[PDB]
Amino acid sequence: NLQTFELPTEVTGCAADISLGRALIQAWQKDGIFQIKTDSEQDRKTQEAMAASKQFCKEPLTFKSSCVSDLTYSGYVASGEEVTAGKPDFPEIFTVCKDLSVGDQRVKAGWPCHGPVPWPNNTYQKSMKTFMEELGLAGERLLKLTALGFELPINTFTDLTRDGWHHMRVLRFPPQTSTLSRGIGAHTDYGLLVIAAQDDVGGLYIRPPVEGEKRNRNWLPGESSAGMFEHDEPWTFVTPTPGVWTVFPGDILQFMTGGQLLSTPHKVKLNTRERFACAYFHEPNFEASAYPLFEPSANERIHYGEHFTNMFMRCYPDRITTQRINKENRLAHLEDLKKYSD
Template sequence: MSIPVISLHAAPEQIGEACRTHGFFYVTDHGVDEDLQRRIEQQSREFFAEDLDTKMRIRMELGGRAWRGYFPVGDELTSGEPDRKEGLYFGAELPPSDRPLHGPNLFPSDEFRTTVLAYMAALTGVGHALMRGIALSLGLDSEYFADRYTRDPLILFRIFNYPPGGAEAWGVGEHTDYGLLTILKQDHHGGLQVKSQDTWIDAEPIPGTFVCNIGDILDRLTGGLYRSTPHRVVGTRDHDRLSWPFFFDPNFDADVRAVGQRVLATEPRWDGADVHEFEGTYGDYLLAKVSKVFPQLTDKIQKS
């Protein structure tokens, strides 16, 4: 089973079919400037080529409650297991704040700052357009999600580098994304795999596209009609692999409520969890997830 390729301007029926059947799709005609994409790829590679001491000058601990900055290989957990990747965490550029996950970013240079902020702005536009299409695919007004959740979205942008580790190395184990919508730029090496029934499918890089997938919160909002799909990253053997996942999520204070009646799942989730049990704000939900991904930062993020 292949992952569908659809236009950002596709008919809502196409978007709905991709969301129901796969939970993953490639998006074309997104309008994100190719030169901007080349710049962010080049500057990311230059940063990860630096020595560890240089990279640690913007380590996440210095970002405090904003949850921004660099982390070395092994510091991030997926399903309780260390990932074989290093990365940079960014979010909306905001003034210093007492609120968790809000505040300024840590950038290695002014040039990187300009590129990252421009890229996040471009991908935010793609996120809004995709959510309009998803709303229409559900028979809702095009602004349904914007009016209730994403007029001022919570933006999380990551840049990951997977160093080579031989045949047995895994980048990231099986998981689903916990937010609303993920928009992923891959480098040419690939490595992303998507689970379809009991089969793992390679999400090979397709030039000019982003890979989009549903997160657990969109699964929750649609009552299970659009289900988040497990995926993983295969370890690299003899080269680095870079990826740029952009997470387009509800506002921190948005109250998470299902669009309609819950759809009975035909099979249990891979991890036995039930994403439909959660009630509360997206911020509450997200902070609980953060505590599992970076347990060493939990006290700093959640401390009043």
């Protein structure tokens, strides 16, 4: 049922690229999502990442819980810590943010959220880094095609995503263990572009655009999308399919396009067995600001580093990362980094 596209290796701006980008936009506007074909290498790397994830999740909780940092939000999140619309969600998560050594100038300077990933081991590290390198190449192709499909300069989005704050959430959902099967409630993702991969089990549902339906701007206080539409059709089951990733827009793409793209609502149902998946965020630079593309007189901006830092401080208010931001007043660095820019 979902539409599938094959991306060119290089996006150059030829008229065929523009046609493809238009078709990607149309698929998002119709279905909220599409598939992209993976080649043998992309597929191999995806499967290796899922295998590493499964092995890590079998480690004892005492070890998993030690994979945390007070410099970066990368690392482990136990089941039941994340909350959607007031209700705790079920997956355990390993988050991979930009892996910066303590010698990096941003880590030395104490920028919030910047530091080395607390990897469980080097084998897991290599599997996830190799996968994320491929995901990033796809993210850049997608963003060039999306700019072209809107008749924008080809580098409109990729100028923002140079050294972007790309990150991945590596998920394990438990089997169902009672009448409850809400693995994650309905929500929209805070990022720019989401590339999702899953194993063969099944559980992701997405909501297409619906004519006449009011959608909230989830980047605004007071317009949370959490829980909305959860018990009303339409919800499309994202059938596990060999040889594809799926792609949907996040909140920052909804903001930049003024709602011509909508951030795709989605939710996860627990299956009768455990399920592994990955959600990759292809993001602006920490220092970049998103802006409305089609409303030149609009003053509103989303500063990405501020957006991310505030999101994760709210997600994980007692994590040692959040404690150190507060103890050392690391949010002051964000204020400073804006000072002499246009």
